[PDB]
Coordinates of all heavy atoms in Angstrom, one line a residue:
Chain C
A124 N 89.8 32.5 -108.6 CA 90.9 33.1 -107.7 C 90.6 33.2 -106.2 O 91.4 33.7 -105.5 CB 91.2 34.5 -108.2
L125 N 89.5 32.6 -105.7 CA 89.2 32.5 -104.4 C 89.4 31.0 -104.0 O 90.1 30.7 -103.0 CB 87.8 32.9 -104.0 CG 87.7 34.4 -104.3 CD1 86.2 34.9 -104.0 CD2 88.6 35.2 -103.3
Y126 N 88.8 30.1 -104.6 CA 88.9 28.7 -104.1 C 90.1 28.0 -104.6 O 90.4 26.9 -104.2 CB 87.7 27.9 -104.5 CG 87.4 27.6 -106.0 CD1 88.0 26.6 -106.7 CD2 86.6 28.5 -106.7 CE1 87.8 26.4 -108.0 CE2 86.3 28.4 -108.0 CZ 87.0 27.3 -108.7 OH 86.7 27.1 -110.0
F127 N 90.9 28.6 -105.5 CA 92.2 28.0 -105.8 C 93.2 28.1 -104.6 O 94.0 27.2 -104.4 CB 92.9 28.7 -107.0 CG 94.2 28.0 -107.3 CD1 94.2 26.8 -108.0 CD2 95.4 28.5 -107.1 CE1 95.3 26.2 -108.4 CE2 96.6 27.9 -107.4 CZ 96.5 26.7 -108.1
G128 N 93.1 29.1 -103.8 CA 94.0 29.2 -102.6 C 93.8 28.2 -101.5 O 94.7 27.9 -100.8
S129 N 92.5 27.6 -101.5 CA 92.2 26.6 -100.5 C 92.2 25.2 -101.2 O 93.1 24.3 -100.8 CB 90.9 26.8 -99.9 OG 90.6 25.7 -99.0
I130 N 91.4 25.0 -102.2 CA 91.0 23.6 -102.7 C 91.5 23.3 -104.1 O 91.4 22.2 -104.5 CB 89.6 23.3 -102.5 CG1 88.7 24.2 -103.3 CG2 89.2 23.4 -101.0 CD1 87.3 23.8 -103.3
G131 N 92.0 24.3 -104.8 CA 92.6 24.1 -106.2 C 91.6 23.7 -107.2 O 90.8 24.6 -107.6
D132 N 91.6 22.5 -107.7 CA 90.6 22.1 -108.7 C 89.3 21.8 -107.9 O 89.2 21.4 -106.8 CB 91.1 20.8 -109.4 CG 90.1 20.3 -110.4 OD1 90.1 20.9 -111.5 OD2 89.3 19.5 -110.2
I133 N 88.2 22.1 -108.7 CA 86.8 21.9 -108.1 C 86.0 20.8 -108.9 O 85.0 20.3 -108.4 CB 86.1 23.2 -108.1 CG1 85.0 23.2 -107.0 CG2 85.6 23.6 -109.4 CD1 84.5 24.6 -106.7
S134 N 86.5 20.5 -110.1 CA 85.7 19.5 -110.9 C 85.7 18.1 -110.3 O 84.8 17.4 -110.4 CB 86.3 19.6 -112.4 OG 86.2 20.8 -113.0
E135 N 86.8 17.8 -109.7 CA 87.0 16.6 -108.9 C 85.9 16.5 -107.8 O 85.2 15.5 -107.6 CB 88.3 16.5 -108.2 CG 88.6 15.3 -107.3 CD 90.0 15.4 -106.7 OE1 90.7 16.4 -107.0 OE2 90.4 14.4 -106.0
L136 N 85.6 17.7 -107.2 CA 84.6 17.8 -106.2 C 83.2 17.5 -106.7 O 82.4 17.2 -106.0 CB 84.7 19.2 -105.6 CG 83.9 19.6 -104.4 CD1 84.3 18.7 -103.2 CD2 84.2 21.1 -104.0
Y137 N 83.0 17.6 -108.1 CA 81.8 17.2 -108.7 C 81.3 15.8 -108.3 O 80.2 15.6 -108.1 CB 81.9 17.2 -110.2 CG 81.9 18.6 -110.9 CD1 82.4 18.7 -112.2 CD2 81.5 19.7 -110.2 CE1 82.4 19.9 -112.8 CE2 81.7 20.9 -110.8 CZ 82.1 21.1 -112.1 OH 82.2 22.3 -112.7
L138 N 82.3 14.9 -108.2 CA 82.1 13.5 -107.8 C 81.4 13.5 -106.4 O 80.4 12.8 -106.2 CB 83.4 12.7 -107.8 CG 83.2 11.2 -107.2 CD1 82.3 10.5 -108.1 CD2 84.6 10.6 -107.2
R139 N 81.9 14.3 -105.5 CA 81.4 14.4 -104.1 C 80.0 14.9 -104.2 O 79.2 14.4 -103.4 CB 82.3 15.4 -103.3 CG 83.6 14.9 -103.1 CD 83.7 13.7 -102.2 NE 85.1 13.4 -101.9 CZ 85.8 12.5 -102.6 NH1 85.2 11.9 -103.7 NH2 87.0 12.2 -102.3
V140 N 79.7 15.8 -105.1 CA 78.3 16.3 -105.3 C 77.4 15.1 -105.7 O 76.3 15.0 -105.1 CB 78.3 17.4 -106.3 CG1 76.9 17.8 -106.6 CG2 79.1 18.5 -105.9
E141 N 77.9 14.2 -106.5 CA 77.1 13.1 -106.9 C 76.9 12.2 -105.6 O 75.7 11.9 -105.4 CB 77.9 12.3 -107.9 CG 77.9 12.9 -109.3 CD 76.5 12.9 -110.0 OE1 75.8 12.0 -109.8 OE2 76.3 13.8 -110.7
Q142 N 77.9 12.0 -104.9 CA 77.8 11.2 -103.6 C 76.9 11.8 -102.7 O 76.1 11.1 -102.0 CB 79.2 11.1 -103.0 CG 80.2 10.4 -103.8 CD 81.6 10.4 -103.2 OE1 81.8 11.0 -102.2 NE2 82.5 9.7 -103.8
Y143 N 76.8 13.2 -102.7 CA 75.8 14.0 -101.9 C 74.4 13.5 -102.2 O 73.6 12.9 -101.4 CB 75.9 15.4 -102.1 CG 75.0 16.3 -101.3 CD1 75.1 16.5 -100.0 CD2 73.9 16.9 -101.9 CE1 74.3 17.3 -99.2 CE2 73.0 17.7 -101.2 CZ 73.3 17.9 -99.9 OH 72.4 18.7 -99.1
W144 N 74.0 13.6 -103.5 CA 72.7 13.1 -103.9 C 72.7 11.6 -103.9 O 71.5 11.0 -104.0 CB 72.3 13.7 -105.3 CG 72.1 15.1 -105.3 CD1 73.0 16.0 -105.7 CD2 71.0 15.8 -104.6 NE1 72.5 17.3 -105.4 CE2 71.3 17.1 -104.8 CE3 69.9 15.3 -104.0 CZ2 70.4 18.1 -104.3 CZ3 69.0 16.3 -103.5 CH2 69.2 17.6 -103.8
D145 N 73.8 10.9 -103.9 CA 73.7 9.5 -103.8 C 73.4 9.0 -102.3 O 72.9 7.9 -102.0 CB 75.0 8.8 -104.2 CG 75.1 8.9 -105.7 OD1 74.0 8.9 -106.4 OD2 76.2 8.9 -106.3
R146 N 73.8 9.9 -101.4 CA 73.6 9.6 -99.9 C 72.5 10.4 -99.2 O 72.6 10.7 -98.1 CB 75.0 9.8 -99.2 CG 75.2 9.0 -98.0 CD 76.7 9.1 -97.5 NE 77.1 10.6 -97.2 CZ 78.0 11.2 -97.9 NH1 78.6 10.6 -98.9 NH2 78.2 12.5 -97.7
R147 N 71.4 10.7 -100.0 CA 70.5 11.7 -99.5 C 69.5 11.1 -98.5 O 69.5 11.5 -97.3 CB 69.7 12.3 -100.7 CG 68.8 13.3 -100.2 CD 69.6 14.5 -99.6 NE 68.7 15.6 -99.1 CZ 69.2 16.6 -98.5 NH1 70.5 16.7 -98.2 NH2 68.4 17.6 -98.0
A148 N 68.7 10.1 -98.9 CA 67.6 9.6 -98.1 C 68.0 8.5 -97.2 O 67.1 7.7 -96.8 CB 66.5 9.1 -99.0
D149 N 69.3 8.3 -96.8 CA 69.8 7.2 -96.0 C 69.3 7.4 -94.6 O 68.9 8.5 -94.1 CB 71.3 7.1 -96.2 CG 71.6 6.6 -97.6 OD1 70.8 5.9 -98.2 OD2 72.8 6.9 -98.1

Side-chain angles (χ1 to χ4, degrees):
Chain C
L125 294 175
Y126 63 89
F127 184 75
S129 176
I130 61 173
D132 186 78
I133 203 163
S134 297
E135 180 180 3
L136 189 59
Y137 289 165
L138 177 62
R139 297 290 184 270
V140 175
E141 290 292 329
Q142 296 177 357
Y143 182 75
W144 293 104
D145 291 331
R146 204 172 60 244
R147 184 65 181 173
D149 292 331

